[PDB]
Amino acid sequence: PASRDRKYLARLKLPPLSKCEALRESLDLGFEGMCLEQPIGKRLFQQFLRTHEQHGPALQLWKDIEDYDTADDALRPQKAQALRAAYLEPQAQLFCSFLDAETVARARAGAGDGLFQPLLRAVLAHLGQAPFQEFLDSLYFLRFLQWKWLEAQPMGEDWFLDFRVLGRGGFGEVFACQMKATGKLYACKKLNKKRLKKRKGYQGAMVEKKILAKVHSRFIVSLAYAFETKTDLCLVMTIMNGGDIRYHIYNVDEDNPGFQEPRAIFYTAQIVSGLEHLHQRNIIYRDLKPENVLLDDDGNVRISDLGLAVELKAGQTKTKGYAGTPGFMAPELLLGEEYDFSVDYFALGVTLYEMIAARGPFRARGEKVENKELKQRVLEQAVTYPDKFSPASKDFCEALLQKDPEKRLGFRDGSCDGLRTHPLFRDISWRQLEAGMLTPPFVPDSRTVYAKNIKGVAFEKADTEFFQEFASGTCPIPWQEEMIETGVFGDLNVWRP
Ligand SMILES: CC(C)c1ccc2oc3nc(N)c(C(=O)O)cc3c(=O)c2c1
Ligand SMILES: [Cl-]
């Protein structure tokens, strides 16, 4: 697919303003939701602030804090100094007068990791008041509505060209496809309708869809579009051309398999960030393993396949249910007891162990064991560590592979902050990692392909009613990201050529 389609790009055209009146009422106009969380909203909000002299200081301070948050440690002292001199001095041209004396004085002191975070909250609080109100009453808000109208237009199977098959497995096939208008590459997972019904796979598919839709993280595969065809239910999501971790452990360098420790730590840190994102939203992954951790072109990883994931309702702290992969399921799960997010951290310990050791903690390399035998080992067998493990790796895996979930390291006080402070992540800049700034340790070769692999019922009302609910359409944030990434936003959002 060495070519976008101009026929479908032509369909991406901004509507007249009258077509956006209906949308203006039936839409969440929250400041946080519109101008911070939605890329096009933020972009248009900042353009508004740019073009209004009085909001210049607040805009540039906002940008410089974000600049400081992603900068190299060597440049941070300088950028902190320049920032304070530019915005936090009464006589400075871009002095932010809207701040309190308390916040300005505070920001002028200290040089910590979380510096300017109180300052950012103060700026965003200010911007969400008067400047936001002015924005709603400006052309830039109307332009946002135009983009939102375009976002809501139908973009089903006709907008996607499948050009290669990636996998064939449980419940359907996975294709690599191109969004025709913009040319962006996606992975499309197609679930066969008849097969789903036959396996009663409605809950598992619906739950996965809803989770992928509501979650937005660089360490979890994103859902961009959800639509239906005559035969399939389709999920268009982030493509990951590097393939799964497991392949990279064993099938590159087969004479010395396993990752170098720095590389294993990098992926672990990325996985942790993904897990935290789910756990902070009361979701349990329940299927963490090398084969479900995928690599993209740049060498960054994401967790995938949320089919066994479960969301706790409000008030609920633990759940019950046998689900997962043999060798990665925690003891408390295997015993049929209640469990929380701790099960995912046990799986992380196993995942990290396998990355370094090039084998499971409970089996030798290539050993085939029956599920009853492997169940006994997880519950009873103590994990041994070969010489490739450093003191940090061993200690960390020992902490994660605790059979008792009370003694096990993981989610505490609404975060993984306690886990981050382990000496294993000594050389990891969490701040840059989470912003996707860190250079990955290994970059996959685009030439190289990192993989192996190769009834009649009628539909009722409840089936079609379910499929429409499933086919929720375009996911707002991933779509906006796409419009910007591909330059379609820049191209259509002009004023004077
Ligand atoms: C055939 C192999 C080299 C390959 C290349 C790209 C891939 O891109 C993917 N993207 C996804 N979102 C998911 C997923 O959502 O599970 C899975 C894959 C692959 O398996 C996958 C496998
Ligand atoms: Cl205006």
Residue numbers in the entry: 28 to 481, 491 to 533
Please give the exact wording used by the authors of the publication that reports this structure.
GRK1 was used as a surrogate for GRK5 because the structure of GRK5 has not yet been reported, GRK1 is known to readily crystallize in various ligand states, and GRK1 is a relatively close homolog of GRK5 with 47% sequence identity. The GRK1·amlexanox crystal structure was solved to 2.8 Å spacings and has four similar but non-identical complexes in the asymmetric unit. The largest conformational variation observed among them occurs in the active site tether (AST) loop that passes over the active site, which is disordered in one chain. Instead, the long axis of the drug extends out to form hydrophobic interactions with the AST loop in 3 of the 4 chains with its isopropyl group. The GRK1 amlexanox crystal structure demonstrates that the drug binds directly in the active site of the kinase in a manner that mimics the adenine ring of ATP. Although a larger panel of kinases would have to be evaluated in order to know how promiscuous amlexanox is, its ability to inhibit diverse kinases likely reflects its structural similarity to adenine, in that in only forms hydrogen bonds to backbone atoms and that it occupies the same flat, aromatic binding pocket in the active site.
GRKs chiefly function to initiate the deactivation of agonist occupied GPCRs primarily through phosphorylation of their cytoplasmic C-terminal tails, which leads to the recruitment of arrestins and ultimately clathrin-mediated endocytosis. Individual GRKs are validated targets for the treatment of human conditions ranging from heart failure to diabetes. Although GRK2 has thus far been the primary focus of drug discovery efforts, GRK5 has been increasingly targeted as a potential treatment for cardiac hypertrophy. The development of inhibitors selective for GRK5 over GRK2 has been challenging due to high sequence identity in their active sites.
